[PDB]
DNA sequence: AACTATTTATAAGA
DNA sequence: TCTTATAAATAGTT
């Protein structure tokens, strides 16, 4: 963008809202591209800072959530901590 | 990337898994960033081509899913077809 | 398992 | 909303 920003909470409410709208779309777009390219079924659930709900599902949210409940095998599970750990360990590329 | 690619299913089993691994991480990194910048809680559930599960949540998947089931109000709900439509305008 | 040039995303502007 | 300069992700090659 016009300037480099640090990843930390945006304190200006107006800025936070504009950024949320733009970046939410960008995330759904990336989910869309991954689902099509790699034949993935994806659900994304977002609650904003006011706990308003925003959702996306490649095809069918109920289908994915149900598959999730039925899953009975160990699987990759990531949190923000894990992402940050990947970034600490990973090269600059 | 070195070249623009069409958004269509990759049939190269190998290219598919390579692309899957990198873009999965890219999506989760963008989720992380949105969660911090805008003070949001985010969950991602992915079943790959083999129906294997991969999940992310900013803090706690259990919490997000519980709150989702409780949610009563109308809210935005998008699918692939909606995104494709938005992209027609560009 | 890495690098790099390019496409794509987006921060600040309009 | 958009546009547009600039940052970030990633396709292809290694």
CSV table of N, CA, C and O in Angstrom, one decimal, chain A residues 5-10 16 19-20 23-59 61-62 64-65 67-68 71 73 75-81 83-84 86-87 90, chain B residues 5-10 16 19-20 23-25 27-49 51-59 61-65 67-68 71 73-81 83-84 86-87 90:
chain,number,residue,atom,x,y,z
A,5,UNK,N,2.7,-0.8,7.0
A,5,UNK,CA,2.1,-0.7,8.3
A,5,UNK,C,2.5,-1.9,9.1
A,5,UNK,O,2.9,-2.9,8.6
A,6,UNK,N,2.5,-1.7,10.5
A,6,UNK,CA,2.9,-2.8,11.4
A,6,UNK,C,1.6,-3.6,11.7
A,6,UNK,O,0.5,-3.0,11.6
A,7,UNK,N,1.7,-4.9,12.0
A,7,UNK,CA,0.6,-5.6,12.4
A,7,UNK,C,0.3,-5.4,13.9
A,7,UNK,O,0.9,-6.1,14.7
A,8,UNK,N,-0.6,-4.5,14.2
A,8,UNK,CA,-1.0,-4.2,15.5
A,8,UNK,C,-2.4,-3.5,15.4
A,8,UNK,O,-2.8,-3.0,14.4
A,9,UNK,N,-3.2,-3.6,16.6
A,9,UNK,CA,-4.5,-3.1,16.5
A,9,UNK,C,-4.6,-1.6,16.0
A,9,UNK,O,-3.9,-0.7,16.4
A,10,UNK,N,-5.5,-1.4,15.1
A,10,UNK,CA,-5.8,0.0,14.6
A,10,UNK,C,-6.7,0.7,15.7
A,10,UNK,O,-7.7,0.2,16.0
A,16,UNK,N,-10.1,1.5,11.2
A,16,UNK,CA,-10.3,0.1,11.5
A,16,UNK,C,-11.5,-0.5,10.7
A,16,UNK,O,-11.3,-1.6,10.2
A,19,UNK,N,-10.5,-0.7,6.9
A,19,UNK,CA,-9.5,-1.8,6.7
A,19,UNK,C,-10.2,-3.1,6.8
A,19,UNK,O,-9.9,-4.0,6.1
A,20,UNK,N,-11.1,-3.2,7.8
A,20,UNK,CA,-11.8,-4.5,8.0
A,20,UNK,C,-12.6,-4.9,6.7
A,20,UNK,O,-12.5,-6.0,6.3
A,23,UNK,N,-10.0,-5.9,3.9
A,23,UNK,CA,-9.2,-7.1,4.2
A,23,UNK,C,-10.1,-8.3,4.3
A,23,UNK,O,-9.7,-9.4,4.0
A,24,UNK,N,-11.3,-8.1,4.8
A,24,UNK,CA,-12.3,-9.2,4.8
A,24,UNK,C,-12.5,-9.7,3.4
A,24,UNK,O,-12.5,-10.9,3.1
A,25,UNK,N,-12.8,-8.8,2.4
A,25,UNK,CA,-13.0,-9.2,1.0
A,25,UNK,C,-11.7,-9.9,0.5
A,25,UNK,O,-11.9,-11.0,-0.2
A,26,UNK,N,-10.5,-9.4,0.8
A,26,UNK,CA,-9.3,-10.0,0.3
A,26,UNK,C,-9.1,-11.4,0.9
A,26,UNK,O,-8.6,-12.3,0.2
A,27,UNK,N,-9.6,-11.7,2.1
A,27,UNK,CA,-9.5,-13.0,2.7
A,27,UNK,C,-10.4,-14.0,2.0
A,27,UNK,O,-10.0,-15.1,1.8
A,28,UNK,N,-11.6,-13.5,1.8
A,28,UNK,CA,-12.6,-14.4,1.1
A,28,UNK,C,-12.1,-14.7,-0.3
A,28,UNK,O,-12.3,-15.8,-0.8
A,29,UNK,N,-11.5,-13.7,-1.0
A,29,UNK,CA,-11.0,-13.9,-2.3
A,29,UNK,C,-9.9,-15.0,-2.3
A,29,UNK,O,-9.9,-15.8,-3.2
A,30,UNK,N,-9.0,-14.9,-1.4
A,30,UNK,CA,-7.9,-15.9,-1.2
A,30,UNK,C,-8.6,-17.3,-0.9
A,30,UNK,O,-8.0,-18.3,-1.4
A,31,UNK,N,-9.6,-17.3,0.0
A,31,UNK,CA,-10.3,-18.6,0.2
A,31,UNK,C,-10.9,-19.1,-1.0
A,31,UNK,O,-10.8,-20.3,-1.3
A,32,UNK,N,-11.6,-18.3,-1.8
A,32,UNK,CA,-12.1,-18.6,-3.1
A,32,UNK,C,-11.1,-19.3,-4.0
A,32,UNK,O,-11.3,-20.4,-4.5
A,33,UNK,N,-9.9,-18.6,-4.1
A,33,UNK,CA,-8.9,-19.1,-5.0
A,33,UNK,C,-8.3,-20.5,-4.6
A,33,UNK,O,-8.2,-21.4,-5.4
A,34,UNK,N,-8.1,-20.6,-3.2
A,34,UNK,CA,-7.6,-21.9,-2.7
A,34,UNK,C,-8.6,-23.0,-2.9
A,34,UNK,O,-8.2,-24.1,-3.2
A,35,UNK,N,-9.9,-22.7,-2.7
A,35,UNK,CA,-10.9,-23.7,-2.8
A,35,UNK,C,-11.0,-24.2,-4.3
A,35,UNK,O,-11.1,-25.4,-4.5
A,36,UNK,N,-10.9,-23.3,-5.2
A,36,UNK,CA,-11.0,-23.7,-6.6
A,36,UNK,C,-9.7,-24.4,-7.1
A,36,UNK,O,-9.8,-25.5,-7.7
A,37,UNK,N,-8.6,-23.8,-6.9
A,37,UNK,CA,-7.3,-24.3,-7.3
A,37,UNK,C,-7.0,-25.7,-6.8
A,37,UNK,O,-6.6,-26.6,-7.5
A,38,UNK,N,-7.3,-25.9,-5.5
A,38,UNK,CA,-6.8,-27.1,-4.8
A,38,UNK,C,-8.0,-28.1,-4.4
A,38,UNK,O,-7.8,-29.0,-3.7
A,39,UNK,N,-9.2,-27.8,-4.9
A,39,UNK,CA,-10.4,-28.6,-4.7
A,39,UNK,C,-10.6,-28.7,-3.2
A,39,UNK,O,-10.8,-29.8,-2.6
A,40,UNK,N,-10.7,-27.5,-2.5
A,40,UNK,CA,-10.9,-27.5,-1.1
A,40,UNK,C,-12.3,-27.0,-0.8
A,40,UNK,O,-12.9,-26.2,-1.5
A,41,UNK,N,-12.9,-27.6,0.3
A,41,UNK,CA,-14.2,-27.0,0.9
A,41,UNK,C,-13.7,-26.2,2.1
A,41,UNK,O,-13.0,-26.6,2.9
A,42,UNK,N,-14.2,-24.9,2.1
A,42,UNK,CA,-13.7,-23.9,3.1
A,42,UNK,C,-14.9,-23.2,3.8
A,42,UNK,O,-15.8,-22.8,3.1
A,43,UNK,N,-14.8,-23.1,5.1
A,43,UNK,CA,-15.7,-22.2,5.8
A,43,UNK,C,-14.8,-21.2,6.6
A,43,UNK,O,-13.8,-21.5,7.1
A,44,UNK,N,-15.3,-19.9,6.6
A,44,UNK,CA,-14.7,-18.9,7.3
A,44,UNK,C,-15.7,-18.1,8.1
A,44,UNK,O,-16.8,-17.7,7.6
A,45,UNK,N,-15.5,-18.0,9.4
A,45,UNK,CA,-16.4,-17.4,10.3
A,45,UNK,C,-15.6,-16.2,11.0
A,45,UNK,O,-14.5,-16.4,11.5
A,46,UNK,N,-16.2,-15.0,10.9
A,46,UNK,CA,-15.5,-13.8,11.4
A,46,UNK,C,-16.5,-13.1,12.3
A,46,UNK,O,-17.6,-12.7,11.9
A,47,UNK,N,-16.1,-12.9,13.6
A,47,UNK,CA,-16.8,-11.9,14.4
A,47,UNK,C,-15.9,-10.7,14.5
A,47,UNK,O,-14.7,-10.8,14.8
A,48,UNK,N,-16.4,-9.5,14.2
A,48,UNK,CA,-15.7,-8.2,14.2
A,48,UNK,C,-15.5,-7.8,15.7
A,48,UNK,O,-15.8,-8.5,16.6
A,49,UNK,N,-15.0,-6.6,15.9
A,49,UNK,CA,-14.6,-6.1,17.3
A,49,UNK,C,-15.9,-5.9,18.1
A,49,UNK,O,-15.9,-6.0,19.3
A,50,UNK,N,-17.1,-5.8,17.4
A,50,UNK,CA,-18.3,-5.6,18.1
A,50,UNK,C,-19.1,-6.9,18.1
A,50,UNK,O,-20.3,-6.9,18.5
A,51,UNK,N,-18.5,-8.1,17.7
A,51,UNK,CA,-19.1,-9.4,17.6
A,51,UNK,C,-20.3,-9.5,16.7
A,51,UNK,O,-21.2,-10.3,16.8
A,52,UNK,N,-20.2,-8.6,15.6
A,52,UNK,CA,-21.1,-8.8,14.5
A,52,UNK,C,-20.6,-10.0,13.6
A,52,UNK,O,-19.3,-10.1,13.5
A,53,UNK,N,-21.4,-10.9,13.1
A,53,UNK,CA,-21.0,-12.1,12.4
A,53,UNK,C,-20.9,-11.8,10.9
A,53,UNK,O,-21.8,-11.1,10.3
A,54,UNK,N,-19.8,-12.3,10.3
A,54,UNK,CA,-19.6,-12.2,8.8
A,54,UNK,C,-19.1,-13.6,8.4
A,54,UNK,O,-18.2,-14.1,9.1
A,55,UNK,N,-19.7,-14.2,7.4
A,55,UNK,CA,-19.3,-15.6,7.1
A,55,UNK,C,-19.1,-15.9,5.6
A,55,UNK,O,-19.6,-15.1,4.8
A,56,UNK,N,-18.3,-16.9,5.3
A,56,UNK,CA,-18.1,-17.3,3.9
A,56,UNK,C,-18.0,-18.8,3.9
A,56,UNK,O,-17.4,-19.4,4.8
A,57,UNK,N,-18.5,-19.4,2.8
A,57,UNK,CA,-18.3,-20.9,2.6
A,57,UNK,C,-18.2,-21.1,1.1
A,57,UNK,O,-19.0,-20.6,0.4
A,58,UNK,N,-17.2,-21.9,0.7
A,58,UNK,CA,-16.9,-22.1,-0.7
A,58,UNK,C,-18.2,-22.5,-1.4
A,58,UNK,O,-18.6,-21.9,-2.4
A,59,UNK,N,-19.0,-23.4,-0.8
A,59,UNK,CA,-20.2,-23.9,-1.4
A,59,UNK,C,-21.3,-23.8,-0.3
A,59,UNK,O,-22.4,-23.2,-0.6
A,61,UNK,N,-22.0,-23.8,3.9
A,61,UNK,CA,-21.5,-23.8,5.3
A,61,UNK,C,-22.0,-24.9,6.1
A,61,UNK,O,-21.2,-25.6,6.9
A,62,UNK,N,-23.3,-25.3,6.1
A,62,UNK,CA,-23.8,-26.4,6.9
A,62,UNK,C,-23.1,-27.7,6.7
A,62,UNK,O,-22.7,-28.4,7.6
A,64,UNK,N,-19.9,-28.1,5.6
A,64,UNK,CA,-18.6,-28.1,6.2
A,64,UNK,C,-18.6,-28.3,7.7
A,64,UNK,O,-17.8,-29.0,8.2
A,65,UNK,N,-19.5,-27.5,8.4
A,65,UNK,CA,-19.6,-27.6,9.9
A,65,UNK,C,-19.9,-29.1,10.3
A,65,UNK,O,-19.4,-29.6,11.2
A,67,UNK,N,-19.3,-31.9,8.5
A,67,UNK,CA,-18.2,-32.7,8.3
A,67,UNK,C,-17.2,-32.5,9.4
A,67,UNK,O,-16.5,-33.4,9.8
A,68,UNK,N,-17.1,-31.2,9.9
A,68,UNK,CA,-16.1,-30.9,11.0
A,68,UNK,C,-16.5,-31.7,12.2
A,68,UNK,O,-15.7,-32.3,12.9
A,71,UNK,N,-15.5,-35.3,12.2
A,71,UNK,CA,-14.1,-35.7,12.0
A,71,UNK,C,-13.5,-36.3,13.3
A,71,UNK,O,-13.6,-35.7,14.3
A,73,UNK,N,-10.2,-37.8,13.6
A,73,UNK,CA,-8.8,-38.1,13.4
A,73,UNK,C,-8.0,-36.9,13.8
A,73,UNK,O,-8.5,-35.8,13.7
A,75,UNK,N,-5.6,-33.8,13.5
A,75,UNK,CA,-5.4,-32.9,12.3
A,75,UNK,C,-4.7,-31.7,12.6
A,75,UNK,O,-4.5,-31.3,13.8
A,76,UNK,N,-4.2,-30.9,11.6
A,76,UNK,CA,-3.5,-29.7,11.8
A,76,UNK,C,-4.4,-28.7,12.4
A,76,UNK,O,-5.5,-28.5,11.8
A,77,UNK,N,-4.0,-28.0,13.5
A,77,UNK,CA,-4.8,-27.0,14.2
A,77,UNK,C,-3.9,-25.9,14.5
A,77,UNK,O,-2.9,-26.1,15.3
A,78,UNK,N,-4.2,-24.7,14.0
A,78,UNK,CA,-3.3,-23.5,14.1
A,78,UNK,C,-4.1,-22.4,14.8
A,78,UNK,O,-5.3,-22.3,14.8
A,79,UNK,N,-3.3,-21.5,15.5
A,79,UNK,CA,-3.8,-20.4,16.2
A,79,UNK,C,-2.9,-19.2,15.7
A,79,UNK,O,-1.9,-19.4,15.0
A,80,UNK,N,-3.2,-18.0,16.2
A,80,UNK,CA,-2.3,-16.8,15.9
A,80,UNK,C,-0.9,-17.1,16.4
A,80,UNK,O,0.1,-16.8,15.8
A,81,UNK,N,-0.8,-17.8,17.6
A,81,UNK,CA,0.5,-18.1,18.2
A,81,UNK,C,1.3,-19.0,17.2
A,81,UNK,O,2.5,-18.7,17.0
A,83,UNK,N,1.0,-19.2,13.9
A,83,UNK,CA,1.3,-18.4,12.7
A,83,UNK,C,2.6,-17.5,13.1
A,83,UNK,O,3.5,-17.5,12.3
A,84,UNK,N,2.6,-16.9,14.3
A,84,UNK,CA,3.7,-16.1,14.7
A,84,UNK,C,4.9,-17.0,14.9
A,84,UNK,O,6.0,-16.6,14.4
A,86,UNK,N,5.5,-19.7,13.2
A,86,UNK,CA,6.0,-20.0,11.9
A,86,UNK,C,6.8,-18.8,11.3
A,86,UNK,O,7.9,-19.0,10.7
A,87,UNK,N,6.4,-17.6,11.6
A,87,UNK,CA,7.1,-16.4,11.1
A,87,UNK,C,8.4,-16.2,11.8
A,87,UNK,O,9.4,-15.7,11.1
A,90,UNK,N,10.7,-19.0,10.1
A,90,UNK,CA,10.8,-19.0,8.7
A,90,UNK,C,11.8,-18.0,8.2
A,90,UNK,O,12.1,-17.0,8.9
B,5,UNK,N,-2.1,-16.9,-13.4
B,5,UNK,CA,-2.7,-18.2,-13.6
B,5,UNK,C,-4.2,-18.0,-13.6
B,5,UNK,O,-4.7,-17.2,-12.9
B,6,UNK,N,-4.9,-18.9,-14.3
B,6,UNK,CA,-6.4,-19.0,-14.2
B,6,UNK,C,-6.8,-19.6,-12.9
B,6,UNK,O,-6.2,-20.6,-12.5
B,7,UNK,N,-7.9,-19.1,-12.3
B,7,UNK,CA,-8.4,-19.8,-11.1
B,7,UNK,C,-9.3,-20.9,-11.6
B,7,UNK,O,-10.5,-20.7,-11.7
B,8,UNK,N,-8.7,-22.1,-11.7
B,8,UNK,CA,-9.3,-23.3,-12.1
B,8,UNK,C,-8.6,-24.5,-11.4
B,8,UNK,O,-7.4,-24.4,-11.1
B,9,UNK,N,-9.3,-25.6,-11.3
B,9,UNK,CA,-8.7,-26.8,-10.6
B,9,UNK,C,-7.4,-27.2,-11.2
B,9,UNK,O,-7.2,-27.3,-12.4
B,10,UNK,N,-6.3,-27.3,-10.3
B,10,UNK,CA,-5.0,-27.9,-10.7
B,10,UNK,C,-5.1,-29.4,-10.7
B,10,UNK,O,-5.5,-30.0,-9.8
B,16,UNK,N,-0.6,-29.2,-7.1
B,16,UNK,CA,-1.8,-29.0,-6.3
B,16,UNK,C,-1.4,-28.9,-4.8
B,16,UNK,O,-1.8,-28.0,-4.1
B,19,UNK,N,0.9,-25.8,-4.1
B,19,UNK,CA,0.1,-24.6,-4.1
B,19,UNK,C,-0.8,-24.7,-2.8
B,19,UNK,O,-0.9,-23.6,-2.2
B,20,UNK,N,-1.3,-25.8,-2.5
B,20,UNK,CA,-2.2,-26.0,-1.3
B,20,UNK,C,-1.4,-25.5,-0.1
B,20,UNK,O,-1.9,-24.6,0.7
B,23,UNK,N,-0.5,-21.5,-0.2
B,23,UNK,CA,-1.7,-20.7,-0.1
B,23,UNK,C,-2.5,-20.8,1.2
B,23,UNK,O,-3.0,-19.9,1.7
B,24,UNK,N,-2.5,-22.1,1.7
B,24,UNK,CA,-3.1,-22.3,3.0
B,24,UNK,C,-2.4,-21.4,4.1
B,24,UNK,O,-3.1,-20.7,4.8
B,25,UNK,N,-1.1,-21.4,4.0
B,25,UNK,CA,-0.3,-20.6,5.0
B,25,UNK,C,-0.6,-19.1,4.7
B,25,UNK,O,-0.8,-18.4,5.7
B,27,UNK,N,-3.3,-17.7,3.5
B,27,UNK,CA,-4.7,-17.4,3.9
B,27,UNK,C,-4.7,-17.3,5.5
B,27,UNK,O,-5.3,-16.3,6.0
B,28,UNK,N,-4.0,-18.2,6.2
B,28,UNK,CA,-4.0,-18.1,7.6
B,28,UNK,C,-3.2,-16.9,8.1
B,28,UNK,O,-3.6,-16.3,9.2
B,29,UNK,N,-2.1,-16.5,7.5
B,29,UNK,CA,-1.4,-15.3,7.8
B,29,UNK,C,-2.3,-14.1,7.6
B,29,UNK,O,-2.2,-13.2,8.4
B,30,UNK,N,-3.0,-14.0,6.5
B,30,UNK,CA,-3.9,-12.9,6.3
B,30,UNK,C,-5.0,-12.8,7.4
B,30,UNK,O,-5.4,-11.8,7.9
B,31,UNK,N,-5.6,-14.0,7.8
B,31,UNK,CA,-6.5,-14.1,8.9
B,31,UNK,C,-5.9,-13.6,10.2
B,31,UNK,O,-6.6,-12.8,10.9
B,32,UNK,N,-4.7,-14.0,10.5
B,32,UNK,CA,-3.9,-13.5,11.7
B,32,UNK,C,-3.9,-12.0,11.6
B,32,UNK,O,-4.3,-11.3,12.6
B,33,UNK,N,-3.5,-11.4,10.5
B,33,UNK,CA,-3.3,-10.0,10.4
B,33,UNK,C,-4.6,-9.2,10.6
B,33,UNK,O,-4.7,-8.2,11.3
B,34,UNK,N,-5.7,-9.7,9.9
B,34,UNK,CA,-7.0,-9.1,10.1
B,34,UNK,C,-7.5,-9.2,11.6
B,34,UNK,O,-8.0,-8.2,12.1
B,35,UNK,N,-7.2,-10.3,12.3
B,35,UNK,CA,-7.6,-10.5,13.6
B,35,UNK,C,-6.9,-9.5,14.5
B,35,UNK,O,-7.6,-8.8,15.4
B,36,UNK,N,-5.6,-9.2,14.3
B,36,UNK,CA,-4.9,-8.2,15.1
B,36,UNK,C,-5.3,-6.8,14.7
B,36,UNK,O,-5.6,-6.0,15.6
B,37,UNK,N,-5.2,-6.5,13.4
B,37,UNK,CA,-5.5,-5.1,13.0
B,37,UNK,C,-6.8,-4.6,13.5
B,37,UNK,O,-7.0,-3.5,13.9
B,38,UNK,N,-7.8,-5.5,13.3
B,38,UNK,CA,-9.2,-5.0,13.4
B,38,UNK,C,-9.8,-5.6,14.7
B,38,UNK,O,-11.1,-5.5,14.8
B,39,UNK,N,-9.0,-6.3,15.5
B,39,UNK,CA,-9.5,-6.8,16.8
B,39,UNK,C,-10.7,-7.8,16.5
B,39,UNK,O,-11.8,-7.5,17.1
B,40,UNK,N,-10.5,-8.8,15.7
B,40,UNK,CA,-11.6,-9.7,15.3
B,40,UNK,C,-11.2,-11.1,15.8
B,40,UNK,O,-10.1,-11.4,16.1
B,41,UNK,N,-12.2,-12.0,15.8
B,41,UNK,CA,-12.0,-13.4,16.1
B,41,UNK,C,-12.4,-14.2,14.9
B,41,UNK,O,-13.4,-13.9,14.3
B,42,UNK,N,-11.5,-15.1,14.4
B,42,UNK,CA,-11.6,-15.7,13.1
B,42,UNK,C,-11.4,-17.2,13.2
B,42,UNK,O,-10.6,-17.6,13.9
B,43,UNK,N,-12.3,-18.0,12.5
B,43,UNK,CA,-12.1,-19.4,12.4
B,43,UNK,C,-12.1,-19.8,10.9
B,43,UNK,O,-12.9,-19.3,10.2
B,44,UNK,N,-11.2,-20.7,10.5
B,44,UNK,CA,-11.1,-21.2,9.2
B,44,UNK,C,-11.2,-22.8,9.2
B,44,UNK,O,-10.4,-23.4,10.0
B,45,UNK,N,-12.1,-23.4,8.5
B,45,UNK,CA,-12.1,-24.8,8.4
B,45,UNK,C,-11.9,-25.2,6.9
B,45,UNK,O,-12.5,-24.7,6.0
B,46,UNK,N,-10.9,-26.1,6.7
B,46,UNK,CA,-10.6,-26.5,5.3
B,46,UNK,C,-10.6,-28.0,5.2
B,46,UNK,O,-9.9,-28.6,6.0
B,47,UNK,N,-11.4,-28.6,4.3
B,47,UNK,CA,-11.2,-30.0,3.9
B,47,UNK,C,-10.5,-30.0,2.5
B,47,UNK,O,-11.1,-29.4,1.5
B,48,UNK,N,-9.4,-30.6,2.4
B,48,UNK,CA,-8.7,-30.6,1.1
B,48,UNK,C,-9.3,-31.6,0.2
B,48,UNK,O,-10.4,-32.2,0.5
B,49,UNK,N,-8.6,-31.9,-0.9
B,49,UNK,CA,-9.1,-32.9,-2.0
B,49,UNK,C,-9.3,-34.3,-1.4
B,49,UNK,O,-10.1,-35.0,-1.9
B,51,UNK,N,-10.3,-34.9,1.7
B,51,UNK,CA,-11.2,-34.8,2.9
B,51,UNK,C,-10.4,-34.8,4.2
B,51,UNK,O,-11.0,-35.1,5.2
B,52,UNK,N,-9.2,-34.4,4.1
B,52,UNK,CA,-8.4,-34.2,5.3
B,52,UNK,C,-8.7,-32.8,5.9
B,52,UNK,O,-8.8,-31.9,5.1
B,53,UNK,N,-8.7,-32.7,7.2
B,53,UNK,CA,-9.1,-31.4,7.8
B,53,UNK,C,-7.9,-30.6,8.3
B,53,UNK,O,-7.0,-31.1,8.8
B,54,UNK,N,-8.0,-29.3,8.0
B,54,UNK,CA,-7.0,-28.3,8.5
B,54,UNK,C,-7.8,-27.1,9.1
B,54,UNK,O,-8.7,-26.7,8.4
B,55,UNK,N,-7.5,-26.7,10.3
B,55,UNK,CA,-8.2,-25.6,10.9
B,55,UNK,C,-7.3,-24.5,11.4
B,55,UNK,O,-6.1,-24.8,11.8
B,56,UNK,N,-7.8,-23.3,11.5
B,56,UNK,CA,-7.2,-22.2,12.2
B,56,UNK,C,-8.3,-21.5,13.0
B,56,UNK,O,-9.4,-21.3,12.6
B,57,UNK,N,-7.9,-20.9,14.1
B,57,UNK,CA,-8.8,-20.0,14.8
B,57,UNK,C,-7.9,-19.0,15.5
B,57,UNK,O,-6.8,-19.4,16.0
B,58,UNK,N,-8.3,-17.7,15.6
B,58,UNK,CA,-7.4,-16.7,16.2
B,58,UNK,C,-7.1,-17.1,17.6
B,58,UNK,O,-5.9,-17.1,17.9
B,59,UNK,N,-8.0,-17.6,18.4
B,59,UNK,CA,-7.8,-18.0,19.7
B,59,UNK,C,-8.4,-19.4,20.0
B,59,UNK,O,-7.7,-20.3,20.4
B,61,UNK,N,-11.3,-22.3,18.6
B,61,UNK,CA,-12.3,-22.8,17.7
B,61,UNK,C,-13.6,-23.1,18.4
B,61,UNK,O,-14.7,-22.7,18.0
B,62,UNK,N,-13.6,-23.7,19.6
B,62,UNK,CA,-14.7,-24.1,20.4
B,62,UNK,C,-15.6,-22.9,20.6
B,62,UNK,O,-16.8,-23.0,20.3
B,63,UNK,N,-15.0,-21.8,21.0
B,63,UNK,CA,-15.8,-20.6,21.3
B,63,UNK,C,-16.5,-20.0,20.1
B,63,UNK,O,-17.6,-19.6,20.2
B,64,UNK,N,-15.7,-19.9,19.0
B,64,UNK,CA,-16.2,-19.3,17.8
B,64,UNK,C,-17.5,-20.1,17.3
B,64,UNK,O,-18.5,-19.5,17.0
B,65,UNK,N,-17.3,-21.4,17.3
B,65,UNK,CA,-18.4,-22.3,16.8
B,65,UNK,C,-19.6,-22.2,17.7
B,65,UNK,O,-20.8,-22.2,17.3
B,67,UNK,N,-20.5,-19.6,19.6
B,67,UNK,CA,-21.1,-18.3,19.3
B,67,UNK,C,-21.8,-18.2,18.0
B,67,UNK,O,-22.8,-17.6,17.8
B,68,UNK,N,-21.2,-19.0,17.0
B,68,UNK,CA,-21.9,-19.0,15.7
B,68,UNK,C,-23.3,-19.6,15.8
B,68,UNK,O,-24.3,-19.0,15.2
B,71,UNK,N,-25.9,-17.2,17.1
B,71,UNK,CA,-26.1,-16.0,16.4
B,71,UNK,C,-27.5,-15.9,15.7
B,71,UNK,O,-27.9,-16.8,14.9
B,73,UNK,N,-29.1,-12.7,14.5
B,73,UNK,CA,-29.4,-11.6,13.6
B,73,UNK,C,-29.1,-11.9,12.1
B,73,UNK,O,-28.3,-12.8,11.8
B,74,UNK,N,-29.6,-11.1,11.2
B,74,UNK,CA,-29.2,-11.3,9.8
B,74,UNK,C,-27.7,-10.8,9.7
B,74,UNK,O,-27.3,-9.9,10.4
B,75,UNK,N,-26.9,-11.5,8.8
B,75,UNK,CA,-25.5,-11.2,8.6
B,75,UNK,C,-25.0,-11.5,7.2
B,75,UNK,O,-25.7,-12.2,6.5
B,76,UNK,N,-23.9,-11.0,6.9
B,76,UNK,CA,-23.3,-11.3,5.6
B,76,UNK,C,-23.0,-12.8,5.5
B,76,UNK,O,-22.4,-13.3,6.4
B,77,UNK,N,-23.3,-13.4,4.3
B,77,UNK,CA,-23.0,-14.7,4.0
B,77,UNK,C,-22.6,-14.8,2.5
B,77,UNK,O,-23.4,-14.4,1.7
B,78,UNK,N,-21.3,-15.1,2.2
B,78,UNK,CA,-20.8,-15.1,0.9
B,78,UNK,C,-20.4,-16.6,0.5
B,78,UNK,O,-20.1,-17.4,1.4
B,79,UNK,N,-20.4,-16.9,-0.8
B,79,UNK,CA,-19.9,-18.1,-1.3
B,79,UNK,C,-19.0,-17.9,-2.5
B,79,UNK,O,-18.8,-16.7,-2.9
B,80,UNK,N,-18.4,-18.9,-3.0
B,80,UNK,CA,-17.5,-18.8,-4.2
B,80,UNK,C,-18.3,-18.0,-5.3
B,80,UNK,O,-17.7,-17.1,-5.9
B,81,UNK,N,-19.5,-18.3,-5.6
B,81,UNK,CA,-20.3,-17.7,-6.7
B,81,UNK,C,-20.4,-16.2,-6.5
B,81,UNK,O,-20.3,-15.4,-7.4
B,83,UNK,N,-18.2,-14.2,-4.8
B,83,UNK,CA,-16.9,-13.7,-5.0
B,83,UNK,C,-16.7,-13.5,-6.5
B,83,UNK,O,-16.2,-12.5,-7.0
B,84,UNK,N,-17.0,-14.6,-7.3
B,84,UNK,CA,-16.8,-14.6,-8.7
B,84,UNK,C,-17.6,-13.4,-9.3
B,84,UNK,O,-17.0,-12.6,-10.1
B,86,UNK,N,-18.5,-10.5,-7.7
B,86,UNK,CA,-17.8,-9.3,-7.3
B,86,UNK,C,-16.7,-9.0,-8.3
B,86,UNK,O,-16.5,-7.9,-8.8
B,87,UNK,N,-16.0,-10.1,-8.7
B,87,UNK,CA,-14.8,-10.0,-9.6
B,87,UNK,C,-15.2,-9.7,-11.0
B,87,UNK,O,-14.3,-9.2,-11.8
B,90,UNK,N,-14.5,-5.8,-12.6
B,90,UNK,CA,-13.0,-5.5,-12.6
B,90,UNK,C,-12.3,-6.4,-13.6
B,90,UNK,O,-12.6,-7.6,-13.7
